């Protein structure tokens, strides 16, 4: 039973309760006014202030307003800034402040609140876990790692901390070390461990280490609703999209884009070769830990539906050609990029992040042997001047064992069943 009333608030419990009921009945108009009256009347009351804040939070809900939620965020702050605040209320107010900052996208602010909460409550392990999430959300994996090490050193059986530690290890390429934490944290059944993010990476770590256990966990993750299937493990999905590893141009409906890519393939090729020759630094090494070995770099013209101006100065005719196809230049969950892969390269089995795109590959320079790509259970080969199309939300794997480089052009398109509105609204990836 949360203890939200300090000594003075116990003396006005009747007014506080009456006002809370108006909020719980959806009369945010009246509830805001009643809690406002209580804040004026009792400017030091934490519970009155928390009521005001909760109603501001709800008002930002209804009107869906960043200024509104920012006000509520200060009011949760205000609750914490009043005198004699009960510990349970202090924790609730600041936790919700951090959460609403995150929900809005103010990850830096959330982090500040979370550090404060841990200073105020040094024995609360769930707060420490929450702080680790804040660090992860700003991309500060080093600090996240220390936080979860501290949690485990005190509560080594904490499943939430186990999965998150294993996530960080896996992301750092500590594959084997990562496995027991992901497995044990999932197996804990603790709150926050039933997350597809941990099934995905536990299986992937196992595959990299040649431990056949991997698909067991994939199946479990699909049993608990996290994956579309065992073979299609993407996590930013729109359910109801046709799912097949390999597509024909006709099936995708983007027949005109395929035609343009194939009819004009030599211009695309030549511009990529010219960049390889005179501006090779524009090709950046793949940086998502997908390679077992080998050299693989990409020269990106579009990402998240934004043209890279410098890059397109290097492939101007190709960018001009592509500009006619908003299905790709506006695919905010895909890229348009040259990709060069050299002999001795093996890309681990891997999965893209979203089922909202299909991936086209146009062959530009393809050695006669040694290059291949598997999607799901089928392995295929590229052809110079020809487009392959696959759904990279399915497990896929690539090998390069030729005696010279392999150059392709990668053109991501919106999944064709996605509606115009979805294409305008889906967050960019």
């Amino acid at each position: 039973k949360p203890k939200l009333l300090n000594k003075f608030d116990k003396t006005i419990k009747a007014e506080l309760d009456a006002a809370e009921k108006l909020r719980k009945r959806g009369k945010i108009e009246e509830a805001v006014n009643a809690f406002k009256e209580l804040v004026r009347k009792y400017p030091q009351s934490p519970r009155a202030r928390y009521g005001k804040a909760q109603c501001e939070d709800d008002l930002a809900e209804k009107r869906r307003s960043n200024e509104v939620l920012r006000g509520a965020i200060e009011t949760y702050q205000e609750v914490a800034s009043l005198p004699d605040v009960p510990a349970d209320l202090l924790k609730l107010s600041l936790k919700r402040r951090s959460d609403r900052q995150q929900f809005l996208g103010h990850m830096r602010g959330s982090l500040l609140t979370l550090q404060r909460l841990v200073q105020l409550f040094p024995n609360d392990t769930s707060l420490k876990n929450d702080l680790g999430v804040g660090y992860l959300l700003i991309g500060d994996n080093d600090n996240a790692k220390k936080v979860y090490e501290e949690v485990l050193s005190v509560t080594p059986n904490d499943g939430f901390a186990k999965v998150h530690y294993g996530f960080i290890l896996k992301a750092q390429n500590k594959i084997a070390e990562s496995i027991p934490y992901l497995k044990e944290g999932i197996e804990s059944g603790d709150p926050g461990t039933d997350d597809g993010r941990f099934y995905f990476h536990l299986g992937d770590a196992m595959q990299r280490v040649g431990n056949k256990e991997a698909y067991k966990w994939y199946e479990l993750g699909h049993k608990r609703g996290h994956f579309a299937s065992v073979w299609q493990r993407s996590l930013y999905n729109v359910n109801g999209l046709k799912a097949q590893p390999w597509w024909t141009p006709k099936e995708t409906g983007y027949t005109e884009l395929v035609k343009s890519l194939e009819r004009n393939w030599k211009l695309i090729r030549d511009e990529g070769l010219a960049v390889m020759d005179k501006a090779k630094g524009l090709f950046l090494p793949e940086d998502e830990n997908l390679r077992e070995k080998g050299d693989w770099s990409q020269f990106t013209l579009w990402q998240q539906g934004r043209r890279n101006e410098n890059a397109c100065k290097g492939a101007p005719k190709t960018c001009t050609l592509l500009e006619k196809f908003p299905e790709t230049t506006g695919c905010r969950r895909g890229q348009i990029k040259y990709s060069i892969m050299h002999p001795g390269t093996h890309v681990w089995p891997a999965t893209g992040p979203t089922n909202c795109r299909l991936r086209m590959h146009l062959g530009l320079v393809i050695p006669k042997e040694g290059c291949k790509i598997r999607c799901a259970n089928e392995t295929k080969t590229w052809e110079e001047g020809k487009v392959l199309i696959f759904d990279d939300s399915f497990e896929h794997e690539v090998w390069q064992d030729a005696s010279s480089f392999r150059l392709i052009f990668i053109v991501d398109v919106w999944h064709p069943e996605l509606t115009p509105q979805q294409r305008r609204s889906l967050p960019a990836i």
Partner: peptide, 20 residues
């Protein structure tokens, strides 16, 4: 996360949130 999920799914979150 100050890195992006392009070919894979390696980041803790792949999107930036901002509103309702």
């Amino acid at each position: 996360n100050q890195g992006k999920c392009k070919d894979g799914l390696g980041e803790y979150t792949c999107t930036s949130l901002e509103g309702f």
